[PDB]
Design a protein around this ligand. Structure first.
Ligand SMILES: *[C@@H]1O[C@H](CO)[C@@H](O[C@@H]2O[C@H](CO)[C@@H](O[C@@H]3O[C@H](CO)[C@@H](O)[C@H](O)[C@@H]3O)[C@H](O)[C@H]2NC(C)=O)[C@H](O)[C@H]1NC(C)=O
Ligand SMILES: *[C@@H]1O[C@H](CO)[C@@H](O[C@@H]2O[C@H](CO)[C@@H](O)[C@H](O)[C@H]2NC(C)=O)[C@H](O)[C@H]1NC(C)=O
Ligand SMILES: *[C@@H]1O[C@H](CO)[C@@H](O[C@@H]2O[C@H](CO)[C@@H](O)[C@H](O)[C@H]2NC(C)=O)[C@H](O)[C@H]1NC(C)=O
Ligand SMILES: O=C(NO)[C@@H](Cc1ccc(F)cc1)C(=O)NCc1ccccc1
Ligand SMILES: *[C@@H]1O[C@H](CO)[C@@H](O)[C@H](O)[C@H]1NC(C)=O
Ligand SMILES: *[C@@H]1O[C@H](CO)[C@@H](O)[C@H](O)[C@H]1NC(C)=O
Ligand SMILES: *[C@@H]1O[C@H](CO)[C@@H](O)[C@H](O)[C@H]1NC(C)=O
Ligand SMILES: *[C@@H]1O[C@H](CO)[C@@H](O)[C@H](O)[C@H]1NC(C)=O
Ligand SMILES: *[C@@H]1O[C@H](CO)[C@@H](O)[C@H](O)[C@H]1NC(C)=O
Ligand SMILES: *[C@@H]1O[C@H](CO)[C@@H](O)[C@H](O)[C@H]1NC(C)=O
Ligand SMILES: [Zn+2]
Length: 910
């Protein structure tokens, strides 16, 4: 089939490279010029051929290839130096061919050199340009890589697949006012004739091309050493060095934890962490040199909040985890990308807990799971492992399914097997697959066949010579059943719904595929129920016993039998499992009255899980909005902030939902209910930074809710801070837990909104900037909102890396959803300039501007617009996902709007 760039048959037909030429080592020399804003470069690839061949296939993109040569030392036809090579392009596969004068030899090593050149990229991918503001008003330039998944090929030609691991030797030629960083430490610096310098770096360990990295910049650092002797450096532009302190501590402590828990030393002399001014993802896990958004890494007590400190701990923890789960062990291909991204997400939980339990990140994890259930309960969801091929289909694989769900599934497991067995299984996995790859099954066989104690040969279990007890019968047997289980969770899209009926001291269990916007008898429903079956490890506790009993489904139905009768049953203890529970008969009722009478009788995660499931079931039509709203009545005595905030979030979301649609009467009663109830808690609240972290997080949430509902004291107190701050011209300090609230109130007048846009450009805290841009985005004046979008498109005052977040900010407010939607449709083509397709930024631009729509009206416009984008060849998965979400909203209103109008009215009466 293939017909290449300038006539002529491209030897290769398939999208994945040929598995016949194996690279081994890369000599790579880069000479970027940052006044010309370009680079020239060169490389030598030591390959090993396995079957004889006359063509060499390798990726490349937007790379002008000057020379091309094949040497060797084991083949005489190719000894130094010749001959030059036949290079042939094919942009449609980002592949090039090397056509060779004469067939090569099985099991012999040849050397592919090549000169190639290009312009510094100008959008977040490959080897690209970035700029920053000094404290003085100066604007400087740096050159950065981001290659994951497939943009190495834009930077130097290579065999871009994660399987093709190789050593990397790297040299960077630079000017004296710049340093240069890469994955490895700097071995040598040679002074040069004109006066340039050339840096050499230790040849890397075996690694994938997407992890290669080099930076050229004038940054500063703070450094510290690990227990195990790793040098750790936090790099940041010079007038910001002192926002790198927390990162230094956190990384050191976290890297120390990771070596212990994994029982594998981080393998490299140094570990650099650099905050990049223009960075599209939040961070990139480059072995030896991790890159970060400024907001993901820097921290400043005067102006960052405690949720910010929690976000920086999170992201640092996520990255450093990747050094094992991703860099040391890498996914065989992008279908199992979750072996990378699921584990890093989940190891956040573990490592942040272990190293910083005063951050309470253990509570907040349930949020990871609730967020993915949203998407996982629509039919436009996917299995965590599905095939992938296009650059676009690979980027798409990076979503809350491969991240959050993988983390959740894995957390389930940890509960089932217990920490000690889980941990043991991980340490095996990593040791076994060090410096190479794994596919899904590898991860389970290891987690399955995990080992204890080790108990020292003499009994047994794990050794060359273990005995054969009546335990070894099930060790090899139960472990093999754990594997049969997880394979369900990785191959089947969706999430199971357990139904629990309590007639007698016996419990009947049914199992279904939980779906939202689809009642137990729509026409839709049966088809979606078809083949689905899970291996759900369940737990439960009763009122008569706070003992944790465990049991495993089994098929569509099953029956357990309690000791004694009891008031209530409560399945999924702490909701450590990936299933929704529905209680039939009087189940919800008993459980609810139990909350109002003595809620401490239920574990506080049980409370969070119950609140979550009760509202989720309303959506699936197995419950009515009144039973759920009824269960919020207990919140007035609730003291665990997880449970309060979760409950408040459902009420706060209904309000915002009603506000969009101009349903003033429900909007206004809802406002009234929230302020009159919850008035005790709203008012126990300092405008301070005092208290723990859930305390601080409660204060922000409750103080926001008050100011969102124009509760005049709260509005007055806020504005009375903004005034003192604007007059003192910054010399006065606003607590960080209220910064966003005060700015938002302040931004309601043109005097305020102006002063704030000003402070935006001057700020050295990228976190304060974050808060200011939110406040700015809450003006009513549509002129101002539009200025913000404009500015953000230019990319000068407001970086374009911020634009998706700001369209979403604007869109979710009533005075800005039309503007946002109009803008996205009228500037689509321009947005495809600025961003991939592909990108995270495009997906947040699409769904942050449409997914909150709730009218068949809006559903109409969005459905066309997507179809308009279809044909042009723009297909994303976010298209169906969004439309399925808009519809879920519409059905929800259809089936529950009256019931919400009435519940409130009733309440007013009582
Ligand atoms: C490409 O990376 C591989 C690893 O992925 C490098 O292999 C490593 O280097 C040598 C093997 O030649 C081994 O060195 C060991 O180090 C200690 C001192 O720390 C020394 O005393 C021992 O006697 C031993 O030689 C090391 O075990 C090995 N590691 C692995 C995992 O294979 C290889 O060097 C790299 N290739 C190039 C060209 O740099
Ligand atoms: C990048 O290119 C610029 C010019 O294209 C180089 O700057 C010149 O360097 C020469 C000798 O090194 C000086 O005599 C000139 O005065 C420089 N020009 C200016 C405008 O200052 C620069 O050295 C190159 N850098 C690299 C790393 O290649
Ligand atoms: C988070 O950390 C805490 C404490 O570090 C773990 O909680 C348990 O603490 C008690 C102390 O009385 C002990 O049973 C163990 O240290 C911990 N439990 C177990 C079963 O080992 C908690 O397990 C951690 N959370 C996660 C998800 O690992
Ligand atoms: O996983 C991460 N670094 O490894 C980054 C994002 C990233 C995206 C694509 C890449 F190729 C590399 C990194 C992250 O935490 N991102 C936030 C996020 C949340 C949910 C889905 C996707 C991203
Ligand atoms: C490559 O060689 C192996 C045997 O060494 C065999 O599969 C066949 O001859 C070749 N296969 C391909 C796909 O070229
Ligand atoms: C590249 O080709 C030019 C053309 O003559 C030659 O002079 C030069 O030596 C070549 N360089 C490399 C690195 O192959
Ligand atoms: C910045 O560094 C200075 C020392 O130059 C230090 O006193 C200060 O605490 C750091 N933080 C800020 C926000 O300036
Ligand atoms: C549900 O998903 C499957 C798999 O993508 C698809 O074939 C089917 O058409 C979908 N049905 C509906 C009603 O969305
Ligand atoms: C709730 O139950 C516990 C357990 O006995 C008890 O200590 C507490 O006083 C009870 N509170 C109420 C209001 O019943
Ligand atoms: C809400 O509806 C009323 C009904 O006439 C209308 O006058 C008002 O402008 C609407 N408000 C918004 C914000 O659309
Ligand atoms: Zn990650």
């Amino acid at each position: 089939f293939p017909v290449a760039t300038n006539g002529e048959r491209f030897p290769w037909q398939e999208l994945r490279l040929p598995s016949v030429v194996i690279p081994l080592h890369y000599d790579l020399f880069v000479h970027p010029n940052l006044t010309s804003l370009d680079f020239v470069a060169s490389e030598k690839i030591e390959v090993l051929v396995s079957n004889a061949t006359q063509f060499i296939i390798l990726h490349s993109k937007d790379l002008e290839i000057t020379n091309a040569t094949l040497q060797s030392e084991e083949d005489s036809r190719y000894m130094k130096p010749g001959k030059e090579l036949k290079v042939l392009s094919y942009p449609a596969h980002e592949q090039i061919a090397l056509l060779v004068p004469e067939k090569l030899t099985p099991h012999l090593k040849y050397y592919v050199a090549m000169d190639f050149q290009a312009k510094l990229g100008d959008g977040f991918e490959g080897f690209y340009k970035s700029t920053y503001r000094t404290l003085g008003g100066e604007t400087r330039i740096l050159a950065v890589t981001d290659f994951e998944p497939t943009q190495a090929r834009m930077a130097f030609p290579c065999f871009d697949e994660p399987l093709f691991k190789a050593n990397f030797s790297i040299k960077i030629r630079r000017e004296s006012r710049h340093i240069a960083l890469s994955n490895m430490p700097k071995v040598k610096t040679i002074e040069l004739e004109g006066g340039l310098l050339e840096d050499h770096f230790e040849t890397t360990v075996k690694m994938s091309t997407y992890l290669v990295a080099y930076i050229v910049c004038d940054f500063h650092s703070l450094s510290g050493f690990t227990s195990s002797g790793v040098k750790v450096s936090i790099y940041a532009s010079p007038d910001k060095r002192n926002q790198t302190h927390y990162a230094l501590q956190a990384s050191l402590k976290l890297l120390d934890f990771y070596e212990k828990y994994f029982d594998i030393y981080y393998p490299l002399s140094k570990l650099d962490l650099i905050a990049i001014p223009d960075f599209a993802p939040g961070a990139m896990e480059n072995w030896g040199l991790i890159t970060y958004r400024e907001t993901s890494l820097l921290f400043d007590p005067k102006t960052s909040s405690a949720s910010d400190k929690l976000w920086v701990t999170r992201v640092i923890a996520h990255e450093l985890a990747h050094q094992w789960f991703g860099n040391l062990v890498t996914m065989e291909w992008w279908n199992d990308i979750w072996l990378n991204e699921g584990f890093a997400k989940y190891m956040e939980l573990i490592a942040v807990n272990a190293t910083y339990p005063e951050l309470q990140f253990d509570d907040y994890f349930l949020n990871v799971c609730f967020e993915v259930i949203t998407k996982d309960s629509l039919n436009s969801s996917r299995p965590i492992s599905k095939p992938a091929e296009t650059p676009t289909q690979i980027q798409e694989m990076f979503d809350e399914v491969s991240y959050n769900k993988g983390a959740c599934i894995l957390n389930m497991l940890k509960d089932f097997l217990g920490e000690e067995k889980f941990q043991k299984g991980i340490i095996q996995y990593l040791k076994k697959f060090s410096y190479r790859n794994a596919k899904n099954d590898d991860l389970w066989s290891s987690l399955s066949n995990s080992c204890l104690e080790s108990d020292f040969t003499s009994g047994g279990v794990c050794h060359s010579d273990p005995k054969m007890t009546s335990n070894m019968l099930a060790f090899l047997g139960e472990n093999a059943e754990v594997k049969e289980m997880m394979t369900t969770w990785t191959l089947q899209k969706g999430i199971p719904l357990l139904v629990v009926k309590q007639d007698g001291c016996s419990l009947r269990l049914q199992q279904e595929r939980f779906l939202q916007g689809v009642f137990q008898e729509d026409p839709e429903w049966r088809a979606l129920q078809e083949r689905y079956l899970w291996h759900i490890p369940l737990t439960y506790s009763t009122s008569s016993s706070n003992v944790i009993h465990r049991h495993i489904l089994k098929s569509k139905t099953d029956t357990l039998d309690l000791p004694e009768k009891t008031s209530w049953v409560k399945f999924n203890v702490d909701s450590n499992g990936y299933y929704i529970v529905h209680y039939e008969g009087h189940g919800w009722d008993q459980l609810i009255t139990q909350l109002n009478q003595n809620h401490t009788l239920l574990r506080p995660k049980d409370r969070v899980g119950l609140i979550h499931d009760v509202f989720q079931l309303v959506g699936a039509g197995r419950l009515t909005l009144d039973k759920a709203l009824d269960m919020t009545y207990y919140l007035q005595h609730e003291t665990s902030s997880p449970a309060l905030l979760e409950g408040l979030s459902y009420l706060e979301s209904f309000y915002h939902m009603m506000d969009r649609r101009n349903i003033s009467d429900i909007s206004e009663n809802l406002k009234r209910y929230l302020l009159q109830y919850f008035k005790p808690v709203i008012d126990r609240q300092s405008w301070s930074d005092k208290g723990s972290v859930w305390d601080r997080m409660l204060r922000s949430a409750l103080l926001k809710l008050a100011c969102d509902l124009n509760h005049a004291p709260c509005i007055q107190k806020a504005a009375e801070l903004f005034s003192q701050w604007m007059e003192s011209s910054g010399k006065l300090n606003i607590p960080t837990d209220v910064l966003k609230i005060v700015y938002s109130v302040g931004a309601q007048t043109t005097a305020g909104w102006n002063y704030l846009l000003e402070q935006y450009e001057l700020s050295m805290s990228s976190a304060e900037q974050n808060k200011i841009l939110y406040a700015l985005s809450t003006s009513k004046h549509q002129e101002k909102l539009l200025k913000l979008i404009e500015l953000g498109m230019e990319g000068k005052v407001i970086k374009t890396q911020n634009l998706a977040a700001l369209l979403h900010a604007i869109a979710r407010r009533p005075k800005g959803q039309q503007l946002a939607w109009d803008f996205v449709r009228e500037n689509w083509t321009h947005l495809l300039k600025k961003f991939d397709l592909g990108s995270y930024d495009i997906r947040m631009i699409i769904s942050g501007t449409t997914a909150h729509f709730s009218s068949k009206d809006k559903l109409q416009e969005v459905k066309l617009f997507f179809e308009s984008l279809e044909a042009q060849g723009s297909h994303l998965d976010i298209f169906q996902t969004v439309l399925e979400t808009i519809t879920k909203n519409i059905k929800w209103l259809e089936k529950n709007l009256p019931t919400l109008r009435t519940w409130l009215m009733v309440n007013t009466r009582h």
